Amino acid sequence: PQKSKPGVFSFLDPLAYEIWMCIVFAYIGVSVVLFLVSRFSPYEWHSSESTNEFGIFNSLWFSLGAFMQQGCDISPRSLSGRIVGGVWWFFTLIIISSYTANLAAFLTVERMVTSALSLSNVAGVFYILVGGLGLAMLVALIEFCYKSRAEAKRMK
Amino acid sequence: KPGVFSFLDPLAYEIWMCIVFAYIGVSVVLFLVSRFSPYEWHTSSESTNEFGIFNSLWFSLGAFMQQGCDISPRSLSGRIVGGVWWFFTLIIISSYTANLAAFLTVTSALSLSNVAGVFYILVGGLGLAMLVALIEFCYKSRAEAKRMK
Amino acid sequence: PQKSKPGVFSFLDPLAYEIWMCIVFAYIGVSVVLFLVSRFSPYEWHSSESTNEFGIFNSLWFSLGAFMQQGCDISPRSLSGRIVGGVWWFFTLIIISSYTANLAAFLTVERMVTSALSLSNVAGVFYILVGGLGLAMLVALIEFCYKSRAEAKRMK
Amino acid sequence: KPGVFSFLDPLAYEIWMCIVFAYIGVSVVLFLVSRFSPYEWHTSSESTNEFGIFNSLWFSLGAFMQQGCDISPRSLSGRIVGGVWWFFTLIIISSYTANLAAFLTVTSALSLSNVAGVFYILVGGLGLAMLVALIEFCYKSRAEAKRMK
Amino acid sequence: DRGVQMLLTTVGAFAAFSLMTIAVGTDYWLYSRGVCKTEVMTHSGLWRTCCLEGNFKGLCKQIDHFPEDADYEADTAEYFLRAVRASSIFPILSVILLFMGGLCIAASEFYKTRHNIILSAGIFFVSAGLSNIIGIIVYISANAGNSYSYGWSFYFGALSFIIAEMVGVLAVHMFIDRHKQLRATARA
Amino acid sequence: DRGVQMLLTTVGAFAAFSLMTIAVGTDYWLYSRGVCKTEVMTHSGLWRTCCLEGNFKGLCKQIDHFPEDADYEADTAEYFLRAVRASSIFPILSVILLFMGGLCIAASEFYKTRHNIILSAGIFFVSAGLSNIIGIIVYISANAGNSYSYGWSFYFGALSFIIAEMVGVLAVHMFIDRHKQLRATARATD
Amino acid sequence: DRGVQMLLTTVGAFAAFSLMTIAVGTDYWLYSRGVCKTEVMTHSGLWRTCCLEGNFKGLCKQIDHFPEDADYEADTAEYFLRAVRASSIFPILSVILLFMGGLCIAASEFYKTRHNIILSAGIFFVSAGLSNIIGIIVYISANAGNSYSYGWSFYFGALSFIIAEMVGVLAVHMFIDRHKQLRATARATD
Amino acid sequence: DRGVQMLLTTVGAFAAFSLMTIAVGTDYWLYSRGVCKTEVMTHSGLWRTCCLEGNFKGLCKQIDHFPEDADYEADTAEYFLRAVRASSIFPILSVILLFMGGLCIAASEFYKTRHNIILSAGIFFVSAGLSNIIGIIVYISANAGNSYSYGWSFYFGALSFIIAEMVGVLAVHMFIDRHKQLRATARA
Ligand SMILES: [Cl-]
Ligand SMILES: [Cl-]
Ligand SMILES: [Cl-]
Ligand SMILES: [Cl-]
């Protein structure tokens, strides 16, 4: 009989789980196709460096930035890469608009099983952010330790 | 009964067609005011800017898509074009977003059946880009083959 | 008794005219202050070129881009310029959110003196776009004619 | 009776405080993971990236304000920080915009009395920036004077 | 090639001119329900509307550009829009600019020394496309003053706009190439 | 690292092909209430639905891919979607493209001189992943046209998509490395 | 072009100062219905409201800067706003800053060696424009606290702000040019 | 200056440690209306809540972290949240990390050759700030499970988080400078 507060992951509520899974799949596919059409041709290569910066890691970064409405320091310059980028931009426009239409209403749904947003409605976002910061620190420290071991091997 | 392309509902069909025409016109005018003057070329010579027709189209698309690009007009006429296109984009995109928010509030989660059309468009674009890249690679390979003989 | 359709400049309806005039004044002031704090100091100068690109025209361009949610190819790097940029960013966020909250509703108000948006509701935006394109063409042609006259004077 | 700073109403005060704390923490972590390693410095030496603490704060502010900046992290840890901050920013800004639309839809045009507070904040920021620039100029002038004697 | 570019520019200019001339003088801009004498399916244009069925089929009635019965006069903006739509000033202006651009292209071949003729033709084509855009917006907006479909004359105008923009791009490219060749000769 | 990359590409291609084939063949795509006799908990795939628990356990019935009466074909989009779902053209196309990529990998291992075969394999794997995406979207949309869950065949297909994309990336990297080595050797010999 | 810049700066500074002084002094800021007896159409400024047309034309009454009864001293924000509006601190501060900038320009025209005076004039002009912005916002907000329109004193103040910003830009440009010439001469003499 | 930077790092570390130790140990985290015996204004902390007025002034009561009368048990998420809030794991963990950072700073003060200790201290301070953020969020969220105000212990914790972040930045800067000097001496 008690009212059910929305979960700690309530920011995913506006879209169905199938939409989220297909979004992840589309992001992976777009990044892979961007890398493919940017780097496969030997005529795009000049030791030898490519004419563009769109490797697989950079392609994933560009696609993630485009979906987050942020942007990076690089942008596709060829016809095929720009086709990929433009269709990804259109997809992002539609999906982000649909998601953010009613996010605040979705975050405060009380289920039977206007007002300001409370911190309990975004505590999950905050938890994910702190976890990401901690994981980034862990990765950086692991890389530093590995490089120190490699330097020790070089000096021995 | 909304269709696969029901995400185009908030704007009428005439608005979409005129949007395409306006994008084409702004891109052409940007290229024209950027490249026509012989005094914008320095010493084939090189232009003082990167706003060819293809890059102008890319700039206009990036501006309308709320993404941006790697170049920006520097001259007065090019910046007038860019500013008026920015104003147009802000108004049109804001109106589309507000009308879509109204359309979706006629709290139920959106289902995949409402965005399947945009997914189809995305995959078709990816296939088209791959096809264009493969055709370009084949043409370059044929050019190299005839160069070697 | 006939219902009066919204005017051709109905995109200004969501904000009062006083807000619009104050927005113009704030934009001018921010551009001027950005140029001042970026270019006044002789220790920011290296014939002699400044360490930054924030002249008055470029400052106006940066401020317009920031208010238009677009951006440009330059960004302030000093502490003073970044304070101006950040406070202008906060201003832009608040004002643009308030403006775009109910734009679609404001564009289709029938006054006695959910449907798709019609083209007549945005014909004014289209008119302003075409006028701007024509004015840009006129300015470019005038500049070309002036430079041709100057070249002829140099030859003679 | 909405106040002068009523544009902060859609979010609670604790959310704003935690937003400031999160911005500070993300900027510090970005600087740390970008600059701590001696192997990211090449030959005072120069770093392979531009992500000092001041630039990290600027990048974080630009990301949260939907404006961007002139730099972007390139390493794995820096990009993890940037991606999680992008996700946080998207969620928080979208929620603020949606709740602001709900607050404003309690069609009457907005009056200047509802945004005078943001105008005051803007003018105060402009004054503070001018003061900081003038103080820096005076300090550099004093340094030049003592250098010339 | 210069010859290929000139041929494409001339062919596109002529095609755009023909398409817009047919558009401005044809009665198939819109399909809707109405009356062809003084509700049945009718095909309409800029100047005349004719029904497709019934005893009155094939008879056209001049469009009531200033209806004093259904709206009994209106504000200044509505009357201004009605006057612009009735005059069809922007479609005819686009036709005129396309014709002038074609004339400039033709005259430039016999005046190869003159360089600003190509630039003027490109400006004319771009302006013709812009006038096309304004005319389309005016027509659609005035139609609003329950199911309708646009005819092939409307899409003829759309294709004419696209072709005019392409031909303007080609003309500006030719201007750029000619000035590049002049600069190269100056260097030599 | 070329041998390790070859082995990883071969193993991943085989894994993706096998997962996609198993997902297409099996009928644990969806868990939902229904009947397998021409309301009980049933598990259904792309072709058949079968009842779990209850009294008619083990009974499998072919899915009626064209439900509802009056056969309204006014909207051609819905009929097109039903035809695409019934044919399962996109999952089978993904299987075929995965097999073609594996065949290209094997032929390149046998030839080891023609570099375009590796490019063809990578293209085939990327296209197989895209076809998998389209098939997943079509299947979910057709189901949309009552608590339910997805079985292990659906997640096998998802993992097949992921692995196919990874193998395509690896194959493109191998093509790039081969051309880079060719260019370096040409520079050295000159 | 230095003399032209000097003349433009002086003329613009004088114009902005005069416009702001006239706007502060005059009472055609707002056209609204009201009374001037210590409902008819009236025109009011920062200090007075005066009746036009009607029978009591020409009568001017001091604005009651603290209206409404019960004197609700609960929120300090409303009292602060009313105090700022009544004092007109920001328009008068803009006038004072414009006068200070003009004085700096005049002193610079005499010394012609101390470059820091021109920077001071530019700073004064920019700050005067900012004070004008703040005063306009405060005035409109206090009015908000019935069709109305703004008189020519309001637009005189707006034009004064615009001209003050232009003159500040010009003065900063002059300071930059002076330092650039100083640096170039120092380079030449070395 | 290296001495100035070391003094600032040590002073900030000690100040943050003291501020957060007082925060975790005082009874002024929150002001609200409640009962401190067995609806009057009361001041609350992490463990106890005293009333500031009335007949029961000065009597603190242990906070009911698991109330079975006004909530009568809840779901897994609520139980986990209230367990985290009751344990106060994140504030105490922030205290511990600040203490270990100070210990590392002192150790490096009497171990000048070892360089990774400064990096460890900076990592400890950054982690202490992150733990501060998590603890603040947990406390505020658990308070939700009609007018209230936060006391000076809460703002003591907030300023401790800020100071910890600043000291971590200073420590990383010292580490960078030390490695810069090392590589500069290696170059020479
Ligand atoms: Cl007609
Ligand atoms: Cl099956
Ligand atoms: Cl007055
Ligand atoms: Cl306590």
Curated annotation (Swiss-Prot), chains A, C:
Q: Report, per the Swiss-Prot or TrEMBL entry, which residue stretches are intramembrane.
A: 54-69, 70-72
- Residue ranges of coiled coil: none
Parts of the chain on the Cytoplasmic side: 73-78
UniProt induction comment: Down-regulated in the pyramidal cell layer of CA1 in the hippocampus by global ischemia.
Q: What is the effect of changing residue 69 to R?
A: In RNA edited version
Tissues of expression:
Detected in forebrain. Detected in dendrites of neuronal cells. Expressed in the pyramidal cell layers of CA1 and CA3 and in the granule cell layer of the dentate gyrus.
Its transmembrane ranges are 17-37, 79-99, 122-142
Q: Which family does it belong to?
A: Belongs to the glutamate-gated ion channel (TC 1.A.10.1) family. GRIA2 subfamily.
A further note on this protein reads: The postsynaptic actions of L-glutamate are mediated by a variety of receptors that are named according to their selective agonists. This receptor binds AMPA (quisqualate) > L-glutamate > kainate.
Quaternary structure and interacting proteins, as annotated: Homotetramer or heterotetramer of pore-forming glutamate receptor subunits. Tetramers may be formed by the dimerization of dimers. May interact with MPP4. Forms a ternary complex with GRIP1 and CSPG4. Interacts with ATAD1 in an ATP-dependent manner. ATAD1-catalyzed ATP hydrolysis disrupts binding to ATAD1 and to GRIP1 and leads to AMPAR complex disassembly. Interacts with GRIP2. Interacts with GRIP1. Interacts with NSF via its C-terminus. Interacts with CACNG2, PICK1 and GRIP2. Interacts with GRIA1 and SYNDIG1. Part of a complex containing GRIA2, NSF and NAPA and/or NAPB.
Give the protein name, as stated in the record.
Glutamate receptor 2
Organism for this UniProt entry: Rattus norvegicus
User: Lineage in the entry?
Assistant: Eukaryota, Metazoa, Chordata, Craniata, Vertebrata
Location of this fragment in the whole protein: 528 to 847 of 883
Curated annotation (Swiss-Prot), chains B, D:
Cytoplasmic topology ranges: 34-50, 70-75
Superkingdom classification of source: Eukaryota
Q: In which tissues is it expressed?
A: Detected in forebrain. Detected in dendrites of neuronal cells. Expressed in the pyramidal cell layers of CA1 and CA3 and in the granule cell layer of the dentate gyrus.
UniProt-annotated location(s)? Cell membrane; Postsynaptic cell membrane; Postsynaptic density membrane
Supply the induction statement: Down-regulated in the pyramidal cell layer of CA1 in the hippocampus by global ischemia.
Function, as annotated: Ionotropic glutamate receptor that functions as a ligand-gated cation channel, gated by L-glutamate and glutamatergic agonists such as alpha-amino-3-hydroxy-5-methyl-4-isoxazolepropionic acid (AMPA), quisqualic acid, and kainic acid. L-glutamate acts as an excitatory neurotransmitter at many synapses in the central nervous system and plays an important role in fast excitatory synaptic transmission.
The UniProt comment on domains reads: The M4 transmembrane segment mediates tetramerization and is required for cell surface expression.
- Describe the protein's quaternary organization and the partners it interacts with: Homotetramer or heterotetramer of pore-forming glutamate receptor subunits. Tetramers may be formed by the dimerization of dimers. May interact with MPP4. Forms a ternary complex with GRIP1 and CSPG4. Interacts with ATAD1 in an ATP-dependent manner. ATAD1-catalyzed ATP hydrolysis disrupts binding to ATAD1 and to GRIP1 and leads to AMPAR complex disassembly. Interacts with GRIP2. Interacts with GRIP1. Interacts with NSF via its C-terminus. Interacts with CACNG2, PICK1 and GRIP2. Interacts with GRIA1 and SYNDIG1. Part of a complex containing GRIA2, NSF and NAPA and/or NAPB.
Question: In its UniProt entry, what is this protein called?
Answer: Glutamate receptor 2
Source organism of this protein record: Rattus norvegicus
From Swiss-Prot, chains F, G:
The GO terms this record gives for MF are: ionotropic glutamate receptor binding; voltage-gated calcium channel activity
Per UniProt, subcellular location reads as: Membrane; Synapse, Synaptosome
Q: Name one GO biological process term.
A: regulation of AMPA receptor activity
For this record, an example GO cellular component is: postsynaptic density membrane
Q: Where are the transmembrane segments?
A: 6-26, 87-107, 117-137, 156-176
Q: Which domain of life is it from?
A: Eukaryota
Query: In what tissue types does this protein appear?
Result: Brain.
Q: What is the membrane topology noted in the UniProt record heading this document?
A: Multi-pass membrane protein
Q: Which UniProt keywords apply?
A: Calcium, Calcium channel, Calcium transport, Glycoprotein, Ion channel, Ion transport, Membrane, Phosphoprotein, Synapse, Synaptosome, Transmembrane, Transmembrane helix, Transport, Voltage-gated channel
Q: Which positions carry the signal peptide feature in this UniProt record?
A: none
Among its keywords, does the record have Transmembrane?
Answer: yes
Function of the molecule: Regulates the trafficking and gating properties of AMPA-selective glutamate receptors (AMPARs). Promotes their targeting to the cell membrane and synapses and modulates their gating properties by slowing their rates of activation, deactivation and desensitization. Does not show subunit-specific AMPA receptor regulation and regulates all AMPAR subunits. Thought to stabilize the calcium channel in an inactivated (closed) state.
Cite the record's note on assembly.
Answer: The L-type calcium channel is composed of five subunits: alpha-1, alpha-2/delta, beta and gamma. Interacts with the PDZ domains of DLG4/PSD-95 and DLG1/SAP97. May interact with GOPC. Acts as an auxiliary subunit for AMPA-selective glutamate receptors (AMPARs). Found in a complex with GRIA1, GRIA2, GRIA3, GRIA4, CNIH2, CNIH3, CACNG3, CACNG4, CACNG5, CACNG7 and CACNG8. Interacts with GRIA1 and GRIA2. Interacts with MPP2.
Entry similarity comment: Belongs to the PMP-22/EMP/MP20 family. CACNG subfamily.
Q: Which disease is it linked to?
A: Defects in Cacng2 cause the stargazer (stg) phenotype. Stg mice have spike-wave seizures characteristic of absence epilepsy, with accompanying defects in the cerebellum and inner ear.
What this protein is called in its record is Voltage-dependent calcium channel gamma-2 subunit
- The scientific name of the source species is Mus musculus
Upper taxonomic lineage: Eukaryota, Metazoa, Chordata, Craniata, Vertebrata
